[PDB]
Amino acid sequence: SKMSDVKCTSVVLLSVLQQLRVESSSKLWAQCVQLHNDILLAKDTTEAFEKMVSLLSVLLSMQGAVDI
Amino acid sequence: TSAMQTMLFTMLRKLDNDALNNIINNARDGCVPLNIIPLKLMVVIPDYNTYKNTCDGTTFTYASALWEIQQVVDADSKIVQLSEISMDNSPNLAWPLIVTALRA
Amino acid sequence: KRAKVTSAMQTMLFTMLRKLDNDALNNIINNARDGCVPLNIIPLTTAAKLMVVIPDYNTYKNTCDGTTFTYASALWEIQQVVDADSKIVQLSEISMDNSPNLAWPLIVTALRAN
Amino acid sequence: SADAQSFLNRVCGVSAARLTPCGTGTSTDVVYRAFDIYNDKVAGFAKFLKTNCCRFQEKDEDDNLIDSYFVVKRHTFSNYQHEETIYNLLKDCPAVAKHDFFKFRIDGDMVPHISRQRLTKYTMADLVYALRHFDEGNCDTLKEILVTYNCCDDDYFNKKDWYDFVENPDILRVYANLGERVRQALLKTVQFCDAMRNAGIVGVLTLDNQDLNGNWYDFGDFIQTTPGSGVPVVDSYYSLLMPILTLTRALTAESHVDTDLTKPYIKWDLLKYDFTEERLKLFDRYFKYWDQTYHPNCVNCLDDRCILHCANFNVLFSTVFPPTSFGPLVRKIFVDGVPFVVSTGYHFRELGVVHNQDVNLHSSRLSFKELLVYAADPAMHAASGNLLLDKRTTCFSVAALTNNVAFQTVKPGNFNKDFYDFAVSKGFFKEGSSVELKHFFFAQDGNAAISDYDYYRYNLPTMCDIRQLLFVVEVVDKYFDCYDGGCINANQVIVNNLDKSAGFPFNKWGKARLYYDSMSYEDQDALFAYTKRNVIPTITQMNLKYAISAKNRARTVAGVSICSTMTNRQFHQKLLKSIAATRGATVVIGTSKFYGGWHNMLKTVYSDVENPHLMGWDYPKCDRAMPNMLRIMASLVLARKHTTCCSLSHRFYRLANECAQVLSEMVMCGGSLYVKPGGTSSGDATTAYANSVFNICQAVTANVNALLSTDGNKIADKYVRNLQHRLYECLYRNRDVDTDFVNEFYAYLRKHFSMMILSDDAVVCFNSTYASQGLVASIKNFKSVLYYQNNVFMSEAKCWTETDLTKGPHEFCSQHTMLVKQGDDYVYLPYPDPSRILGAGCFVDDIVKTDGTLMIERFVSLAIDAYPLTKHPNQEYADVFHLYLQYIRKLHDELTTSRYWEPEFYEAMYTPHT
RNA sequence: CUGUGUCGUC
RNA sequence: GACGACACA
Ligand SMILES: [Zn+2]
Ligand SMILES: [Zn+2]
């Protein structure tokens, strides 16, 4: 049961990523969408975790939201 | 706007993974990765009181895996060797210090 | 409902006709056998500016090297090289070592060098 | 022994005395060489077992075997004398393997026999066969044709997927490496046909009588007459050879200085568009004897069959001329004394050069229809746009319109509304459940639309077999008899979704409603009359779509301009509405899976098949791969209903308009025009029915090549043998139409192959015993037809054969089928994938459509098609729909007999209306 | 984008 | 019939 919630949270992660006008670059958005796609197309619970934490590293590299 | 961020934070505090909360805590207390974690990582440490707990020598605990510094950078772009960190010569710099690590 | 769209099409035609009633086009149609030439040659022969899209460094190397390259059998002088972010890129920043630091698709624009 | 050595020194005679005893002194009768025979008993293009051959082999220098065999047979005196008496006439032209007739005594006494000279190992018939009837795990005489001719290496096949087209497209190069050989074959066949005419030899030319080195042999089916008059019947050879002339590109050397593959490409004149004299010279060089008047242009044809013939020739004849001369032609039309540059003609890759007729310089002003036809051409757009060189794709770039290319991103779909909290609450999405959410709204970066449009790179020039197409068309039109058609006026047309994209440039000022309301009825009809005499090229804006899928590929939908659809609707609405409004036929479009629809459809497919086993298929990249000749065939089959409304010239101009507008038009992907090589533009008005016509064409072609390529000497029936005889005869003989046999073959198909064809997705109910004896087609007969006609490869992992009847089609229209019980009335039910249903439920396209205001109607339309899950034996499948109904009731509550809280709604949508 | 079916007001 | 929605190609 730790794959459906992971895929859905990856979807909401890519959504909140684009919501910050991150789509205004080539490398960053290409890598982000590759992460999201390889999360969705995954079945393993660990690779999805690694790509999730990489997406979260992307989200925290900027300063749009830190400590609610 | 804030609804997506709220849902994301709730269902990140619902997954409850080790590396996930590790990254979230480090980003809460200042440690921000200057790039995307590859699978060569750079992190900023806005202080030193919350740094003694994470790195010690060539060992670096981050992303639930091991990292290893290769050279440390400071604000004025000097190579701070890792035995300079002490309780006396601390306020002689701007606290954001770039740590350049590597995988196993 | 009708006058508006008629005027739209008419002024659009007469506007793209400003950069179309030049002398190079009249020259190339004065050479045809019956005043009829294919369309695929009109820009290739009389358009006074080139736009080449470039996905990576290897195609750039052999398509737009130096400053004067020859496509469509003419000299082209390069100005305003830009990348996928609509960001100007100097000719020095396009190097093999720095190629992984800039956007992949470039847009090199040249002018017909007489 | 010594007899064998004498046999060797005697077969040698004048050639090299270093032959290898391949087989034995006796006839080695090597098995399974595909023949092309036609006599009073057997007919077809099949793979009979040879018995008379003895394929000796010479070895090259250094004791290395070489590709050269002497086929020593055991002929009789009669045919021996016949062959000698028709070979002494032809002993001078090059395309004659030196038969070298002689005698010996191979029985101990008095036995005659022949011994060939340097033909090949494998035959031209084997080349054509192994290229047509392609098997992914049986192509043994195709891993040798490609190897023994330096085209590729042996280890190229250990690479898995070596044979595919849509992946590993270097096989195109490995095949095209045979182009010079096939061109030498064409040349030699011409130097043979003319050598026969000029020497008086009347007879027939077949494929298995040539050889890859170009040589010919088996000169027995001829007969001698007064020299100077004899004509060879060369329909079969050219017809069966055609489909590989554009698979190996036998005309890749006419683009050179002296037609060799070393000199530089012809520096063609940029301002030359006619090419009709070069076309006549191409025909006089390669098909000097193809016995039917070939017109270089297609405007000088006689009927749709002449159009198919001439266009099928030109689709190969126009791979030589530069791609910078096709597309529209332009002229300096003056308006008020100001030079306009618009289209006064068109050069088609197949239909030749066609000129308009309502063209006139020195116009004082322009009207609405004139402004439309002007601003719709790519002429004024590509004449003033910056020259473009797009290195991201292969399609011929034309002219960037704006000053900077535009990238567009594909957003990710919403997720996790309260219909996931409830899904995880009500015992779903737990550890390894029977269902798992496996349908997402995937996302793509900026460089997606152009990399997806680049998938037209799989569309190739294809020269279909014309003597077979000119019969498949009749069978298809028989499949389309029960529909009425014909041109309709403006007032009689009906338009739905009047607020969609009106195409480029028309989308810069409004939707299609704007133009449809601005134009008057007289103006629309005059534009239609004008387009029935003039050719109008248009532009299709190809943009990305936003939908859910189980893959991560992008979906690019195209929108054609409005001046194209506005006329195509008047042209085709009658026939399309008639196809939609009829039930019980083959093409099932306009059906309704509700109210016993699925059950009645499946019964009609089970109509009266004797020993039934269902089937199914899918064409990979169907739209990106459909050849231009098959698209033109579909257009002509749809236009065949016009016989009392428009003359031949009107209908030809309508076909040319359709081609220039939807087949090979200007596509604006991004901010720059491109040349679309072919395929079906999604925004076409008639694409869902052109795909049906193409579907029936592929199925009938598979049936024809399964009934011909079967060994007629192994057909226990006494009627199928004669039906196959007359099938081959109506294919490659009798240039006219044979309504008798067309009717009888259509009846045979309807009785033993019950198709069910909604666009691009079909299900069949074939007689299993016949499809096992080879009397009809199977998946092994669809894969091959695809590989040599549509230029794709149909993997057997997406094709299902159901050996049972109780359980219905595994998947038709993405729905499953479960034979259910409705009160002692066992009927069929369409049920979908529960993963897809749960995905559609949880997610939503974009965040304005969260089910918060009045959007429960979104969730009712999911249980309307997810009801039969409740009747599945797996309890979780039923719990899918029960969870659906529970949360639909909770939605109805929090929002406070069409009440969607009780299941007495979905139960009614599957029992007949009354 | 082209259509096909199925639901909701006037 | 007008509008909106969902599903299939
Ligand atoms: Zn003709
Ligand atoms: Zn008509």
Give residues 790 to 829 of D whose Cβ lies within 8 Å of A: none
Give the DSSP H/E element, type plus range, for residue B4: helix B2-10
First to last CA, chain A: 28
The radius of gyration computed from the CA coordinates of chain A, to the nearest angstrom, equals 12
Q: Which of D190-193's residues contact partners 24+ apart within 8 Å by CB, and which partners?
A: D190/D285, D190/D286, D190/D287, D190/D288, D190/D289, D191/D93, D191/D94, D191/D95, D192/D90, D192/D93, D192/D95, D192/D96, D192/D216, D192/D232, D193/D232, D193/D234, D193/D288, D193/D289
Resolution of the experimental model, in Å, one decimal: 3.3
Spatial separation of the C-alpha atoms in residues D124 and D341, rounded to whole Å: 50
Q: Where are the domains of chain C?
A: 24-113
Query: What are the b/e assignments for A27-39, b being 16+ CB within 10 Å?
Result: bbbbbbbebbbeb
Planar angle of CA D513, D516, D518, nearest 5 degrees: 100
Burial of D346 (0-12, 13-18, 19+ CB in 10 A): buried
Tokens of D789: 């006609």
Angle D116-D122-D128 from CA coordinates, rounded to 5°: 125
Where do the DSSP E strands lie in D600-706?
A: 612-616, 666-668, 672-675
DSSP β-ladder status, D666-668 and D539-544: parallel
The position carrying tokens 């505090």 is B13
How many contacts (CB atoms, under 8 Å) link A and C? 11
Beta-carbon separation of A5 and B11 below 8 A: yes
Nearest to D386 among C2, C8, C51 (CB): C51
Q: Which helix (DSSP H) or strand (DSSP E) does residue D893 occupy?
A: helix D875-895
Location of structure tokens 């590729």:
D152
CA distances to B44, B94, D738 from B33, rounded to whole Å, are 7, 18, 78
Using DSSP's 3-state secondary structure scheme, residue D255 falls into coil
For residue D695, give the amino acid letter: N
3-state secondary structure D358-407: CCCCCECCCCHHHHHHHHHCCHHHHCCCEEEEECCCCCCEEEECCCCCCC
Residues in D closer than 8 angstroms to C37, CB to CB, are 270-271, 273, 329-330
Is A27 near chain C, with CB under 8 Å? yes
List, in sequence order, every residue forming a beta bridge with C108; answer none if it has no partner: C52
Which residues of chain A are at the D interface, by a Cβ-Cβ cutoff of 8 Å?
Answer: 1, 3-5, 7-9, 11-12, 14-15, 18, 23, 26, 29-30, 33, 36-37, 40-41
Annotated binding residues of D for Zn(2+), written as ranges, equal 295, 301, 306, 310, 487, 642, 645-646
Q: How far is CA B24 from CA A58, A67, B29, D416, in A?
A: 12, 10, 9, 22
Best of A7, A23, A28, A55 to disrupt the D interface by mutation (most D CBs within 10 Å)? Answer: A23
Residue with tokens 């050719």: D535
**C-alpha torsion angle, residues D166, D172, D174, D176 (rounded to 10):** 160
- Could you write out the DSSP letters of every residue in B25-89? HHHHTT-EESS-----EEEE-S-STTTTTTEETTEEEETTEEE--SEEE-TT--B--TT---SSS
Query: Within 13 Å of residue D160, how many CA atoms lie on the same side as its CB?
Result: 0
SS3 D268: coil
Q: D64-71 and D539-544: which strand pairing?
A: unpaired
> Which ranges of D717-855 does DSSP label H, i.e. alpha helix?
720-732, 739-752, 768-773, 779-789, 834-842
Amino acid at D23: G
F6 C1' closest Cα residue: D861
Stated as kind and residue range, the H or E segment containing D35 is: strand D35-38
What is the C-alpha separation between D175 and D189, in angstroms, rounded? 21
Name every residue whose Cβ is closer than 8 Å to that of residue B53 and which is 6 or more positions away in sequence. none
CATH says B19-104 is which class?
Answer: alpha beta
CA of D628 to the centre of ligand 1 (A): 17
CATH number attached to the domain at C24-113: 3.30.70.3540
Within D385-465, where are the H helices?
A: 418-425, 449-453
Q: Which of D434, D436, D440, D544 is the best substitution to test chain A (most A C-beta atoms within 10 A)?
A: D440
How far: D595 CA to E6 C1' (Å)? Answer: 11
- Contact yes or no for D120/D68 (Cβ under 8 A): yes
Tell me if D25 sits within 8 A of D4, measured CB to CB: yes
Do the Cβ atoms of B2 and D407 come closer than 8 Å? Answer: no
Q: Does A61 touch chain C (CB under 8 A)?
A: no
Which ranges of chain C does DSSP label H, i.e. alpha helix?
3-16, 23-29, 42-46, 57-63
Which method resolved this structure? cryo-EM
D247: closest CA among D461, D457, D394, D45?
D461
Distance from CA of C25 to the nearest CA of D (A): 9
Strand F: which residues 638-697 of D lie within 7 A (CB)?
688, 691
Q: Which of D805, D806, D786 is nearest to D795 (CA)?
A: D786
**CA-to-C1' distance for D747 and F9, Å?**
28
Burial class (CB in 10 A: 0-12, 13-18, 19+), B70: exposed
How far is residue D400 from each of residues C52, C69, C72, C109, D514, measured CA to CA in Å? Answer: 9, 19, 15, 11, 27
DSSP letters for D77-125: HHHHHHHHHHHTTTSSSSS------EEEBTTSS-EEE----S--SS-HH
Cα first-last separation, chain C: 46
Chain center to CA of D365: 45
Report residues 450-509 of D contacting strand F, contact meaning Cβ closer than 7 Å. 496, 498-499
